[PDB]
């Protein structure tokens, strides 16, 4: 099962002393009402952000702990054994057994820390291992200890898990030894409000955000709060999802164009600023081979690409295999060079159905012989001749290596945005930028064809046109507002009625809606009573009793 921890995990925040001081601080705390696993039955604890370890036993059942990820030669680990004479810490990645029982260079010995309560804290903070110790004699009671610091080692090793150690008087199943109880609480960065009495010790602690009462106490930095209305924080609606949006994109002529150019006169076109038309028939998209690195479909939501580069050349069938990264031979050197970190996608397909001619096609040429490899991105307009050049033979009776092939390489240089859209929900809207948060509803705005977007007073835009289907949306910054905590005073009770400012909770105890917003935790009565705590927009409060 599980159980809640009432008031465990309190200690001096700064490891420094103050006299008669009330004071609110944030540090690596055990949050109030945190989970601990009762281990009472007729055990490995992960070290998440610090372990608060409590033990209840008449005698010394626990022998120590074995910290470390794997406790092997290649994994750094740690052993602590707390004997009645001395406590020994060995941080040397020693090998430990799976079932604990008792009969490198590092080594450490220090004084022993001591129906019996023993509390300890292991903390892995800022490359430092902090140890706190405490021993006292004895539903969870409210047991309190201002846990003074004991040790802070500056060494950092991979500590993730540890387990208690048990050693019997004699063994090889075995004797019916007692079942000790220990609670583990994972530490979390949290802030509290403490009170230190005149003698100077921690005596009263309040979580800053346990309750609206707890929050108003943490606001006033105190522990007695009068009857009234107090303002603590604000309810901000989480902006659900982020929706990103982008007069025709000329993708059709990049691959499906009837005629292409030769290798030397490679064609490069940047395509953007248009509705992405990818549905135009090219080859019925029979994509059986695909693997691209650098660009992924996931990032198109949070990545906008700057340019689309297309490079084209002409080769034959039995040589497409040799055109790849890490390929050698005369084909790649004299036709096209592939970079090591090529960022793009490889598209290769058959083109015999379109490039077939009864009399033969001589419009596809390639350079097979040259003095040297062409430089990258080199431009040459010379017509000097080295028949010197051979054209591909395209016959139906030849082999599969004589088939015509159109090969084009697409690259993305990062020296266009992503689709998707939602409506009527407080979300993060982006349209090639314009990063805003709010509700996009049906817009009472009607624009002119170039009127891309509109603005209200105080430079807060009102409408957005859809780059895809060309519709206009109304934007209101997200529905949020403060919170006021009607509290009738800790002297009387601890019942809080919290009002959200200017938010309709009909569209996000009994919940009432007033002109000022959404009053939850208040049983809206209709009766007439004199006002004590004005709640807002003409409504007040009273205590039912």
């Amino acid at each position, epitope marked *: 099962a599980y159980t809640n921890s009432f008031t465990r995990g309190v200690y001096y925040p700064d490891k420094v002393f103050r006299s008669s001081v009330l004071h609110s601080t944030q540090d690596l705390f055990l949050p109030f009402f945190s989970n601990v696993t009762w281990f009472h039955v007729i055990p490995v604890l992960p070290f998440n952000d610090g372990v608060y370890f409590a033990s209840i036993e008449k005698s010394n059942i626990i022998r120590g702990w074995i910290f470390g990820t794997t406790l092997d030669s290649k994994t750094q680990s740690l052993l602590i054994v707390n004997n009645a004479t001395n406590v020994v810490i060995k941080v040397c990645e020693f090998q430990f057994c799976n079932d604990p029982f008792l009969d490198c260079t590092f080594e450490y010995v220090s004084q022993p820390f001591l129906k019996n309560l023993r509390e300890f804290v292991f903390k892995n903070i800022d490359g430092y291992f902090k140890i706190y110790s405490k021993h006292t004699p004895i539903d969870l009671p409210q047991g309190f200890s201002a846990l003074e610091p004991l040790v802070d080692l500056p060494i950092g090793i991979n500590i993730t898990r540890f387990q208690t150690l048990l050693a019997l008087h004699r063994s090889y199943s075995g004797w019916t030894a007692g079942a000790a109880a220990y609670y583990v609480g994972y530490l979390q960065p949290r802030t509290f409000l403490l009170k230190y009495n005149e003698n100077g010790t921690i005596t009263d602690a309040v979580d800053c955000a346990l309750d609206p009462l707890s929050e108003t106490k943490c606001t006033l930095k105190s522990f007695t709060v009068e009857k009234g209305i107090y303002q603590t924080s604000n309810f901000r609606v989480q902006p659900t999802e982020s929706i990103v949006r982008f007069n025709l994109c000329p993708f059709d002529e990049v691959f499906n164009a009837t005629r292409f150019a030769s290798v030397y006169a490679w064609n490069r076109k940047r395509i953007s600023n248009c509705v992405a038309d990818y*549905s135009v028939l090219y080859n019925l*998209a*029979p*994509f059986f081979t695909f693997k691209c690195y650098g660009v992924s479909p996931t990032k198109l939501n949070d990545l906008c690409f700057t340019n689309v580069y297309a490079d084209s050349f002409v080769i034959r069938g039995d040589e497409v295999r040799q055109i790849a990264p890490g390929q050698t031979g005369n084909i790649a050197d004299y036709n096209y060079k592939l970079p090591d970190d090529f960022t793009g996608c490889v598209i290769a397909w058959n083109s015999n159905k379109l490039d077939s001619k009864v009399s033969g096609n001589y419009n596809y040429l390639y350079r097979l012989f040259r003095k040297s490899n062409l430089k990258p991105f080199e431009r040459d307009i010379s017509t000097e001749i080295y028949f010197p050049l051979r054209s591909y033979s395209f016959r139906p009776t030849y082999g599969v290596g004589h088939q015509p092939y159109r090969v084009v390489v697409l690259s993305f240089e990062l020296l266009k945005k992503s689709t*998707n859209l*939602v409506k009527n929900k407080c979300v993060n809207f982006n349209f090639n930028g314009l990063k805003g948060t709010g509700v996009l509803t049906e817009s009472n705005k009607k624009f002119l064809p170039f009127q891309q977007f509109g603005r209200d007073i105080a430079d807060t835009t009102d409408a957005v046109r859809d780059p895809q289907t060309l519709e206009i949306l109304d934007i209101t910054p997200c529905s949020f507002g403060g919170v006021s905590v009607i509290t009738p005073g800790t002297n009387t009770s601890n019942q809080v009625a919290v009002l959200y400012q200017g938010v309709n909770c009909t569209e996000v105890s009994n919940v009432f809606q007033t002109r000022a917003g959404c009053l939850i935790g208040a049983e809206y009565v209709n009766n007439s009573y004199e006002c004590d705590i004005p709640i807002g927009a003409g409504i007040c409060a009273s205590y039912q009793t």
Partner: antibody
Amino acid sequence: QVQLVEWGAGLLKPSETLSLTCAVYGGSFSGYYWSWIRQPPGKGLEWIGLINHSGSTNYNPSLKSRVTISLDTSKNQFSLKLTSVTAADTAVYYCARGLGIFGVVTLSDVWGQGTTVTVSS
Amino acid sequence: NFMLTQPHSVSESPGKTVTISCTGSSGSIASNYVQWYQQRPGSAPTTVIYEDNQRPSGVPDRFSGSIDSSSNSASLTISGLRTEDEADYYCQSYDSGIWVFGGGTKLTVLG
């Protein structure tokens, strides 16, 4: 998050057509290849087809002669047709989204529940 | 002439890591995607694998796959095993534009 559901007649007979309907919840059809996935129980799958926002579709050759997919942006729904159902047609069917290149449907990244469509005559 | 072969029986105790492969038969398995599936009793597999190494939103981050070119074989791996994942896993590959499936793997969590 987007939720995809399927519902239709689960008792079929030989020689008529399979009809199944899918509705989308909290999603858009922009830049997705919505597809249907089929598997006779106990045995392996037989992928049905695909469709994107503009409606460009690709089918398995074993089903192209018998399968048809349609998209409805007005009703925010897309349905499946499969004609001449046989003993091999007895299977569960789902609708699902997709993310790929021009019809690579391999991240219908939400598990489908679907119905049980059986031929019983 | 693509053929897809997967191990008949793979067993794993809960909490440990288990992997299921789909060995390529004809050609180099790198060119063609091999997608790893899951079939609950009375259910059918879906499509969750593309580029073989990514995990999307709405699906647990534990289902992981891989294709290794050295042994010309695929792999689907589970790290955070749970008893709910009792599902028959099948592999599907592309055979020169033909969608060809495999025999599949029956996965059971030790109870």
